[PDB]
């Protein structure tokens, strides 16, 4: 109903409701619940044991805790794995005490020492395992729902049963099935995929239904964490629109700084760690100001000056404003250089790269008839010299060197590149004619002694200007 | 446990230990899965030992040969003692040649306190 | 006069004198229409003066000042005297640093000789 994107952005902000202090700690506790759901669901995964084993191998060569607790508290899950592996895989998979040992392995996981690089690896490995089993189910659906004339409802009732051995394949060749009698015409992909599913199951050491509900718990916890992150970032858009007042200069628009503070607040969500007892606005202020300075350093300038030189030139502008207020006169580079504790040539160098280049549509004249661009000199200049002599000297060499009735002109035209593509040295022109370099040098000196005399090369002499 | 705060505690700079990390001088620490590097207290002991070796006037090759036999239970202190003896013998040879230059030169430059006359007997005798 | 026999006279090679030419302490010589450096008798005197110090009597930071004051040509025999007094002050600070280093090495480097008793803590005592 409007035309400004920032006003309907404010409308979408006003659609959601803000937070009080108790609402802030409630959304922080919802973030904690969304994190800890994945933290306890990953304890039931068999690859977490190998992940903690490679973590113990990484910290073997190593406020903070002592490393002895990292050496001791990263090896009991290996013992639980080697006392569970004789029950979860051997002597049948469907067992109650095997699931009790699985829960015992899961309840000893709280020795986290959380690192954001460590958290990505288990999520990535479980996501590509979920992607592998999902494209396995997708290719099975492509070979069974689309082919052999049976709908999607005749697949899930046999898919949810075992999905381990060959019983589900000839379960789809049921009591009559005249449309699905093509056995060997469809077997060639499905048993090759079932062997891949079986080797995946023997890699994880568990049936496909348990890892299916484990990945469903992963998706549920990730969706709940995403909704908690969404309400956290939506309740704090007043923070970015209230912090974006102090950086409202004419280098960028408002919306780019707002959406950079949005990703700064999104980083501050996972960098919050609310158990210290602080508010989200106070710690998020630093991250959003960092994102705002990063956007005003990378963007808001045609010539992209980096963030450290942006910081030094902002300090130089503040020192120049302070010396303007303390003196009244224009700030010389000497006082700014001695107050910056930097040499003066670096001060003038960062002063040279002062601001965005004058755009092409500024009215430098008296009216709006002639803008900029009608005053720029050509860098690729084509002078009367550069247009006339660059061909007339070529014609003069083609006229004079044609009088050279031997191979000296043929070895001199490739000595510099006249009527040739690649410029050659004496060695490359030697291998064609005269492999000893000094023969070509002596014939070049003879051609020089023939051409340097002001008798017939005076037209070549007049081209020195 | 990072490298520049430990350099500020030990009195060093980060450029020196980064140049030691560039060559084969300091043992490479494990990456802390970020844009930083952690230090073992044994690595800090090797760092301050190499700083004490460089501050007194040892060349960095012989101090590297000292820190290669550091933080290990072998620690042979006879061949490296002979190597440091050859190092200070080369240092004393440098001292001997510089003092040879010192008592070779210093008896010829008494007069001519900066006049505009183009006559000096030092350069025509040396060359 | 291409500098090859001149290089055998002065006792150097083309690379060191080329590096001297690229620095701001040697006067620009003559190029005899081929890019080759030409050195006259005064240039030969400057070359033998800078090689009679850098390889014999001085380092680059003092021989450069000597060859800079030599092409004045009004030479001074007391500016070089206070220059070499500052130079011998610098090298006497240098040799007192090296003799303190030698005394510290002889104080905290004595250990057992070559035998079956390894793991000497003398390197740990030098660590501090
Ligand atoms: Ag004189």
């Amino acid at each position: 109903r409007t035309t400004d994107p920032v006003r309907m952005y404010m409308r979408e902000m006003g659609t959601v409701e803000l937070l009080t202090r108790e609402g802030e700690i409630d959304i922080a506790k919802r973030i904690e619940d969304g994190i800890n759901q994945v933290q306890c669901s990953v304890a039931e995964y068999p690859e977490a044991i190998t992940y903690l084993l490679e973590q113990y191998d990484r910290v073997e060569a190593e406020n903070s805790i002592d490393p002895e607790l990292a050496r001791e508290k990263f090896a009991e899950l290996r013992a639980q794995y080697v006392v569970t592996r004789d029950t979860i895989k051997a002597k049948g998979r469907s067992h109650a005490t095997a699931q009790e040992e699985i829960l015992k392995l899961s309840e000893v996981f709280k020795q986290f020492r959380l690192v954001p690089k460590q958290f990505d690896y288990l999520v990535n490995s479980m996501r590509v395992m979920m992607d592998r089993v999902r494209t396995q189910e997708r290719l099975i659906m492509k070979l069974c729902v689309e082919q052999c004339k049976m709908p999607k409802k005749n697949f899930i009732t046999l898919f949810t049963g075992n999905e381990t051995s060959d019983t589900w394949f000839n379960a789809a060749i049921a009591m009559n099935k005249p449309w699905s009698e093509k056995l060997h015409d469809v077997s060639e992909e499905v048993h090759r995929a079932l062997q891949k599913l079986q080797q995946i199951e023997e890699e994880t050491g568990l049936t496909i239904e348990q890892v299916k509900d484990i990945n469903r718990r992963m998706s549920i916890g990730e969706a709940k964490a995403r909704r908690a992150k969404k309400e956290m970032v939506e309740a704090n858009l007043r923070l970015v629109i209230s912090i974006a007042k102090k950086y409202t200069n004419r280098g960028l628009q408002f919306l780019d700084l707002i959406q950079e503070g949005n990703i700064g607040l999104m980083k501050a969500v996972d960098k919050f760690e609310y158990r210290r007892g602080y508010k989200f606005s106070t710690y998020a202020t630093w991250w959003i100001r960092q994102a705002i300075t990063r956007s005003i350093a990378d963007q808001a300038r045609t010539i992209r000056i980096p963030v450290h030189m942006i910081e030094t030139i902002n300090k130089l502008n503040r020192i120049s404003r302070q010396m303007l207020q303390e003196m009244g006169r224009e700030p010389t580079p000497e006082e700014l250089a001695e107050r910056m504790l930097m040499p003066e040539d670096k001060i003038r160098k960062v002063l040279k790269i002062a601001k965005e280049p004058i755009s092409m549509e500024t009215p430098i004249g008296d009216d709006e008839d002639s803008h900029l661009g009608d005053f720029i000199e050509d860098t690729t200049l084509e002078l009367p010299l550069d247009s006339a002599t660059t061909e007339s000297l070529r014609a003069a060499t083609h006229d004079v060197l044609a009088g050279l009735t031997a191979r000296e002109a043929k070895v001199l035209r490739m000595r510099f590149g006249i009527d040739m593509n690649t410029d050659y040295t004496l060695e490359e022109v030697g291998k064609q004619f005269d492999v000893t370099r000094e023969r070509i040098r002596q014939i070049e000196a003879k051609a020089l002694r023939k051409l340097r005399h002001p008798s017939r090369s005076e037209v070549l002499r007049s081209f020195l200007d | 446990m990072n490298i520049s705060d430990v350099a500020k505690i030990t009195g060093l700079t980060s450029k020196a230990i980064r140049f030691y990390e560039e060559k084969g001088l300091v043992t490479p620490p494990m990456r802390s899965e970020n844009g930083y590097r952690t230090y073992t207290q044994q690595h800090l002991n090797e760092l301050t030992l190499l700083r004490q070796a460089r501050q007194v006037g040892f060349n960095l090759e012989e101090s590297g040969e000292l820190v290669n036999l550091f933080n290990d239970p072998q620690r042979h202190s006879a061949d490296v003692k002979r190597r440091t003896l050859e190092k200070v013998a080369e240092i004393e040879r440098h001292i001997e040649e510089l003092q040879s230059m010192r008592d070779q030169l210093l008896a010829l430059a008494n007069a001519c306190p900066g006049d505009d006359s183009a006559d000096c007997p030092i350069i025509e005798n040396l060359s």
Side-chain angles (χ1 to χ4, degrees), chain A residues 1-25 27-46 48-50 52-92 94-112 114-116 118-148 150-233 235-302 304-354 357-366 368-465, chain B residues 1-5 7-43 45-46 48 50 52-127:
Chain A
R1 71 183 86 102
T2 177
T3 176
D4 209 10
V6 70
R7 290 170 184 168
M8 53 172 49
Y9 167 69
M10 286 284 292
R11 172 203 314 177
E12 198 63 83
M13 190 265 298
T15 303
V16 80
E17 199 262 325
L18 52 94
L19 288 172
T20 43
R21 172 79 175 273
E22 47 84 21
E24 181 181 6
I25 67 177
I27 296 305
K29 281 166 189 176
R30 286 195 65 177
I31 283 287
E32 192 259 351
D33 289 356
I35 287 177
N36 271 108
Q37 181 66 222
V38 197
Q39 280 289 94
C40 60
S41 78
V42 79
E44 312 168 359
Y45 213 85
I49 294 97
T50 44
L52 287 182
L53 275 181
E54 86 187 32
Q55 159 78 10
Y56 172 73
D57 294 1
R58 278 194 194 99
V59 305
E60 193 180 358
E62 266 185 354
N63 49 2
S64 315
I65 209 66
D66 60 326
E68 190 42 67
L69 201 70
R71 292 291 185 84
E72 201 266 331
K73 286 298 183 179
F74 280 158
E76 65 269 359
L77 274 82
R78 176 189 180 180
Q80 298 321 294
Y81 157 73
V82 302
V83 306
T84 318
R85 63 177 179 89
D86 48 351
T87 58
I88 187 183
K89 303 131 185 176
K91 301 178 298 181
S94 159
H95 202 29
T97 54
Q99 299 299 318
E100 184 64 84
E101 288 178 358
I102 282 174
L103 292 179
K104 175 185 57 182
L105 187 138
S106 79
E107 285 299 317
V108 292
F109 190 73
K110 209 59 68 183
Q111 287 83 238
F112 47 99
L114 269 179
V115 174
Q118 283 172 17
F119 189 78
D120 297 334
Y121 181 72
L122 296 100
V123 175
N124 284 326
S125 47
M126 295 176 316
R127 268 181 179 269
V128 304
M129 285 193 64
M130 182 50 174
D131 191 15
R132 276 168 58 180
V133 73
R134 268 308 300 180
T135 182
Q136 166 83 7
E137 293 172 35
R138 275 302 177 182
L139 66 93
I140 286 170
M141 269 185 170
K142 282 155 196 173
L143 63 90
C144 82
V145 174
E146 189 70 87
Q147 197 177 2
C148 277
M150 38 179 179
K152 200 196 301 179
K153 58 181 178 60
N154 292 338
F155 159 70
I156 322 176
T157 61
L158 300 170
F159 158 74
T160 188
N162 46 6
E163 213 63 34
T164 303
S165 76
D166 300 320
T167 76
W168 79 269
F169 176 53
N170 43 19
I173 321 295
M175 64 301 295
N176 48 317
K177 287 246 180 178
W179 43 85
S180 281
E181 214 61 42
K182 297 177 296 298
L183 195 73
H184 284 347
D185 221 336
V186 78
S187 305
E188 189 281 331
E189 43 179 350
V190 72
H191 74 81
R192 192 168 51 188
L194 194 49
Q195 291 302 316
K196 183 177 61 61
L197 190 60
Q198 279 183 2
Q199 74 98 4
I200 279 174
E201 284 170 1
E202 82 193 68
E203 272 172 348
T204 188
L206 196 47
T207 174
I208 204 64
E209 298 301 281
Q210 288 197 217
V211 62
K212 258 162 196 165
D213 60 68
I214 277 179
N215 290 135
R216 280 176 183 270
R217 286 301 158 88
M218 298 306 176
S219 159
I220 283 298
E222 196 75 25
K224 195 158 189 173
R226 184 173 293 184
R227 293 311 176 273
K229 280 181 182 60
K230 180 253 289 181
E231 61 200 356
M232 178 85 85
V233 297
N236 294 127
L237 300 178
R238 298 161 187 86
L239 265 300
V240 287
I241 72 183
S242 45
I243 204 174
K245 322 181 307 299
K246 323 177 193 64
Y247 301 93
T248 321
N249 62 329
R250 305 302 178 272
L252 279 173
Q253 314 154 61
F254 203 76
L255 299 101
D256 293 326
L257 316 178
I258 288 302
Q259 271 212 316
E260 204 77 22
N262 285 339
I263 81 176
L265 201 152
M266 192 184 306
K267 289 181 177 300
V269 161
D270 55 282
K271 291 294 288 184
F272 190 27
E273 187 40 73
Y274 77 103
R275 299 185 184 273
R276 301 280 298 272
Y278 295 111
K279 296 178 182 178
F280 197 40
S281 75
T282 306
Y283 189 72
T285 303
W286 305 106
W287 272 95
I288 293 157
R289 190 180 285 107
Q290 169 256 346
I292 280 178
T293 50
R294 180 188 175 93
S295 46
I296 209 167
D298 296 359
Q299 330 179 0
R301 298 280 304 276
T302 72
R304 182 182 172 272
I305 171 167
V307 64
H308 49 91
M309 216 60 60
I310 274 292
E311 182 66 36
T312 60
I313 201 56
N314 276 127
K315 288 178 60 61
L316 192 146
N317 285 18
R318 190 175 72 255
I319 285 300
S320 78
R321 285 174 185 177
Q322 187 199 14
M323 295 299 107
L324 274 154
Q325 292 297 299
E326 284 279 344
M327 180 173 297
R329 220 184 57 189
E330 283 164 291
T332 65
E334 273 73 28
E335 46 184 346
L336 311 184
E338 63 85 29
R339 202 159 301 270
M340 209 49 192
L341 50 91
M342 294 298 299
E344 318 186 4
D345 58 333
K346 314 295 180 57
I347 299 303
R348 302 185 193 94
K349 174 189 178 182
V350 306
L351 193 62
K352 166 185 261 202
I353 180 57
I358 303 319
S359 44
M360 278 297 112
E361 295 320 296
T362 77
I364 209 62
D366 57 15
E368 305 172 351
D369 57 330
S370 198
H371 310 86
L372 217 56
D374 214 3
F375 299 95
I376 314 175
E377 212 185 335
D378 199 6
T379 79
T380 171
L381 267 192
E382 297 289 281
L383 280 184
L385 178 64
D386 299 358
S387 53
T389 50
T390 49
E391 201 264 349
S392 68
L393 188 57
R394 175 178 172 176
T397 60
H398 205 259
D399 213 348
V400 166
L401 296 181
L404 264 53
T405 173
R407 51 187 175 185
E408 50 261 9
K410 203 168 181 59
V411 303
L412 266 189
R413 281 196 296 109
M414 42 195 70
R415 180 54 186 92
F416 308 98
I418 301 181
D419 199 0
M420 273 303 170
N421 168 76
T422 316
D423 190 20
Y424 304 114
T425 182
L426 308 174
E427 298 215 338
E428 315 303 300
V429 71
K431 303 173 178 179
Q432 309 170 22
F433 294 86
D434 279 305
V435 299
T436 51
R437 268 198 300 109
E438 300 91 5
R439 178 63 212 103
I440 299 294
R441 182 254 168 195
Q442 190 64 226
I443 206 171
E444 182 183 349
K446 183 193 299 177
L448 281 187
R449 289 172 185 177
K450 184 182 175 59
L451 281 174
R452 277 177 180 178
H453 197 65
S455 44
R456 285 193 289 185
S457 59
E458 274 295 87
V459 64
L460 261 291
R461 185 51 180 267
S462 315
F463 267 104
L464 63 90
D465 294 326
Chain B
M1 294 61 65
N2 208 342
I3 76 170
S4 159
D5 292 308
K8 283 290 186 176
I9 284 299
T10 55
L12 285 181
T13 175
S14 193
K15 301 265 188 173
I17 52 177
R18 276 197 288 254
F19 178 67
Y20 300 153
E21 190 60 44
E22 184 189 11
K23 293 298 182 179
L25 267 296
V26 57
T27 73
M30 296 300 300
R31 183 60 73 95
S32 45
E33 305 163 348
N34 213 8
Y36 319 115
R37 280 169 177 169
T38 175
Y39 269 170
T40 300
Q41 201 67 34
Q42 293 294 99
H43 282 58
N45 202 340
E46 190 259 6
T48 179
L50 169 56
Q52 197 66 233
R54 199 54 187 90
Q55 273 182 357
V56 297
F58 303 146
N59 46 359
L60 204 69
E61 306 112 333
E62 198 55 52
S63 72
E65 280 290 328
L66 301 161
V67 304
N68 278 126
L69 53 90
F70 199 39
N71 318 81
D72 52 337
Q74 202 269 317
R75 257 184 282 264
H76 206 184
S77 162
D79 54 356
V80 69
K81 179 182 174 58
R82 201 256 306 176
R83 283 153 195 167
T84 50
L85 200 61
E86 295 298 277
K87 166 184 57 58
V88 292
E90 186 193 19
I91 285 162
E92 280 292 324
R93 282 177 282 181
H94 279 294
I95 288 172
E96 277 174 281
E97 63 92 20
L98 70 89
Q99 78 171 7
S100 88
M101 301 191 291
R102 166 194 172 95
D103 50 24
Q104 187 263 331
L105 164 63
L106 258 65
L108 203 63
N110 315 337
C112 192
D115 293 18
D116 55 355
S117 87
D119 203 78
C120 313
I122 300 181
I123 311 296
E124 59 91 19
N125 184 32
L126 291 178
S127 51

